[PDB]
Structure formats: C-alpha cells, structure tokens
Symmetry: C3
Subunit: 114 residues, 3 copies
C-alpha cells in the first residue's frame, strides 16, 4: 500500500517518527506487512480547502485490495485521527482518495504484482 | 473536487489570488459548493513536456461525479485558459487527468461520502 | 503519456539529461511520439518504503491505452532499470501505479483527447 499526505502545515510541525507511525498504523489497518507499506509526507504546500488556507491535507491511499465501503470509513477515521493529533489538521479539512489497484497495474522490482 | 497543478513555472510567477480564483471558477464550473473545492499548486518543478522544459503543467481533477466527455472539455477550456492567462503556460503544454471518484472512495471528516 | 517519480534521492544525485532519457525511453516503450510524453521528477522527498528511508521511489504512469499486464511488466523493467542505474534506487524499493486513462478523461489544449 502507498499513502501520500500533501499539506500546507510546515515541515517543522511534522513530528519525528510520523513516517514510522503511519507505516505501523497502515500495516495494522490494511493487514499487509509493514515491508510493503510506503508513506510520503509533503509539507509546506500552496493549497486551499473551501477557499481557506487554514491547515488542510489532500491524501491518497493506493492498495491492491483492502479497499471498500466499510474499510474506507475505518481508514478515514484512523487517518483523520492521526492528522488531527500529529499535524493539528481538522478532519473536515482532509480529503483522502482511495484507489483499489489491480495487481497487474502496480509495478515493483522490475515486474508487476500480478 | 480536488484540483492539483504541478508546473515548472517559478513560485514568483504564480500571481497573488490564484488559489482563490481556481476555487471560485471550479465551484462554478462543477456546480459544487466552494466549501468542497480543494486546490493545490506546486511550482518550481523539474518536469518536461514533449522533451522540452518550456513552461508546462501536469494536473489532475478528482470529483465525485460532474466528470464526463462534455464537462471535461469545458473544464479543460477553463483551466487551460487560467493557466495561460495567469502562469503564461501554452494550453498545448498542459495535461489534466480527470477522475470520477465513487463517494465510497473519498474520505472526509472521519468517514466517507457514501 | 505522463510519468511522475517521487523520491527521497537528493536533487544533486539526479544526473543531467535524466528527463530527456525518461522522455526518450517512454516514447519507445509506449510507442507514442516523444512530443506527447511528459515527465516529472520530485527529489528530496520525505518518504519511507517498508519502514525505512534508504533510496526509494513512488511513481505513476498515466497513458491513454498501452496499459496492460505484459506491457506494465515491460514498463516496470525499463523504469526500475533507469531508477537503479541513474538514481541508485533498488528495484524492490520502487512502486509504479499504472493508469489506463480514457481519452475523454484527459484534458489538453483547451479540450480533451476524445
């Protein structure tokens, strides 16, 4: 799985250990081993949410399966919780796009996961 | 809606008010309330279009609905027009990927839109 | 076609000529003319792969067609090969998300490719 957070929160406001926490929590949430979790945090961005430059985040979670109605509600509660606690972003200023990737449409290690 | 523009135009060439202009125009074009429009501009990027490093932009628009052949033509004329007028990017050096997101695949406010 | 690579490798480790090499090799792999290939490299990123921060890459390839099981395996070999040779990223620390875009869902030059 791949989780990306783009945010206008400054780099200094991202706590040490945040990538590790995201890795651990996403491994537990998706049920996938942490070795297959990739995380990417992009602070200091020029962005707005609802016309406002108050703290916000635009995020994606790509996974081969483990994507669906109930799972995505649970991921959203988890990840909005982490962004509120660690980056002080309001949950109503977070979008998370979920992508259920076909194994044949994910490249890794000179081939695909198919 | 979530609109992202990645460009090699420098930050100083992005005019004041641009994120607000994008927010307003996307609200009107998509019909969505401005409170649901998120915009993200990423200048100073290392990118090429057709092998050339002349000004260019690589963009995405994700929306829950309001995506389709005629709508996307209209969005493209709007957004290429703004990028030409405001960032001096030629329309033929702009790509916009359109994504019709299922409500169950968008997280917001600790849940999803389903 | 549009190829994006996000990496923690520093900007100074991206060799001169890399965007041109990506453009050339993707034109040949996809069969599309180089005038239609866009490339974007984002170094110096805050990311982890499998819980660690040794060089890694998170990438996308969006293309109108020319996406499928065998083609994507070939793209993965080509692109992992380039990232290993040029950026010294291990192929097992690269993820590439492939997207087969409908022509009506790609904006360009004030309209779509439909």
């Amino acid at each position: 799985p791949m989780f990306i957070v783009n945010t206008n929160v400054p780099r200094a406001s991202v706590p040490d250990g945040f990538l590790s926490e995201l890795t651990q929590q996403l491994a537990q949430a998706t049920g996938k081993p942490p070795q297959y979790i990739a995380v990417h945090v992009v602070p200091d961005q020029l962005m707005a949410f609802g016309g406002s430059s108050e703290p916000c985040a635009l995020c994606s979670l790509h996974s081969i399966g483990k994507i669906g109605g109930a799972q995505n509600r649970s991921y959203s509660k988890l990840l909005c919780g982490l962004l509120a606690e660690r980056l002080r972003i309001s949950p109503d200023r977070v979008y998370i796009n979920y992508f259920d990737m076909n194994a044949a449409n994910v490249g890794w290690n000179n081939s695909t996961f198919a």
